[PDB]
Amino acid sequence: EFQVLFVLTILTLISGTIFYSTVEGLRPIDALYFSVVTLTTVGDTPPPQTDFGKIFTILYIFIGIGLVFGFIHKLAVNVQLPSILSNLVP
Amino acid sequence: EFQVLFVLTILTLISGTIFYSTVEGLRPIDALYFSVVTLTTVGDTPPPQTDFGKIFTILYIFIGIGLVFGFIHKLAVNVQLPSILSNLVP
Amino acid sequence: EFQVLFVLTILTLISGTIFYSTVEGLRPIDALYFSVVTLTTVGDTPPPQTDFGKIFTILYIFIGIGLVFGFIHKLAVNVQLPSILSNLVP
Amino acid sequence: EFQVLFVLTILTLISGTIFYSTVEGLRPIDALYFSVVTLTTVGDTPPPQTDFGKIFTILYIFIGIGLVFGFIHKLAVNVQLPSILSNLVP
Numbered sequence A, B, C, D: 001e002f003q004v005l006f007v008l009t010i011l012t013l014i015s016g017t018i019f020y021s022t023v024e025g026l027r028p029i030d031a032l033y034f035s036v037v038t039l040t041t042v043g044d045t046p047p048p049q050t051d052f053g054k055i056f057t058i059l060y061i062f063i064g065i066g067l068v069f070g071f072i073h074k075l076a077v078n079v080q081l082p083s084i085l086s087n088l089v090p
């Protein structure tokens, strides 16, 4: 489960990194950052400047938001919860 | 269900596209983009400049956020989940 | 329930409108807009410029986000859902 | 539960405050603000300017978003709900 959401999240971010670095001309790290803050809805960066960028982003949001939060709802619910929960036991 | 959330999401975005292109003077694609990042809460674009735009946006957020995420909670929960889940079966 | 979440959401937004118009010097409509996009996490506007504004916003987010989404999870789950659901019945 | 989510949220924000004030050169209050709007997804501030800042932020989002909302889903669900609910009783 977690490992699978891990991989799926990775592929989604890799695709975003390749897309924005190519079409929006971003450095890879900036392309990855944009992909991450977009899918997590933080959206603290300027929007895409090209129409291709805008269209892809719209589809990217709809298809990737569900996956990213599903993964997050496990990274802390099935991995970080116990580590802290079990330790909260004297 | 999915098909219905599909259509409802479409109508909501169409209304947003017409509204922002007319009142905020955005090109249709930019009006659609603003509508999408607003309802998904990414909000990476500058806010509306007119009071009419601000008022509509406030109402648009409250009435459309629930629908958009409901749709998303199906596009990946009842459509993208199986496609990957079932295939995860040797 | 809905009517109560309605009122609670209203009071929260009224407080935000008064606060930002006074401390950040925003016109009331802009103060209301900032309050709304902040609590719904759209956050498409520039952040507060004063330290008082930043501190209040931090507390405002933590105390109001839960309420605002609870209300939203009813405005469409217990009000907009039936209207469309029941009508989907031939 | 609440008290524990309280503390965990605190530590996460303290780490963010120290990180951004040091690496991005922000005043402590601004570092705390950035940490808060990032983890709650409001993201109304300019993104980090350094690559170290971008990388940390990516990891910070994935590890802290779940915790922050879990806490929020208690600050109003197990603390602010009764206070208003019980009082709604004549």
Ligand code: NA
Residues within 6 Å of the ligand: A041, A042, A043, B041, B042, B043, C041, C042, C043, D041, D042, D043
């Ligand atoms: Na956001």
Ligand code: NA
Residues within 6 Å of the ligand: A041, A042, A043, A044, B041, B042, B043, B044, C041, C042, C043, C044, D041, D042, D043, D044
């Ligand atoms: Na945002």
Ligand code: NA
Residues within 6 Å of the ligand: A043, A044, A045, B043, B044, B045, C043, C044, C045, D043, D044, D045
């Ligand atoms: Na912004």
Ligand code: NA
Residues within 6 Å of the ligand: A040, A041, A042, B040, B041, B042, C040, C041, C042, D040, D041, D042
């Ligand atoms: Na958000």
Ligand code: NA
Residues within 6 Å of the ligand: A042, A043, A044, A045, B042, B043, B044, B045, C042, C043, C044, C045, D042, D043, D044, D045
């Ligand atoms: Na933003």
Ligand code: NA
Residues within 6 Å of the ligand: none
């Ligand atoms: Na800007």
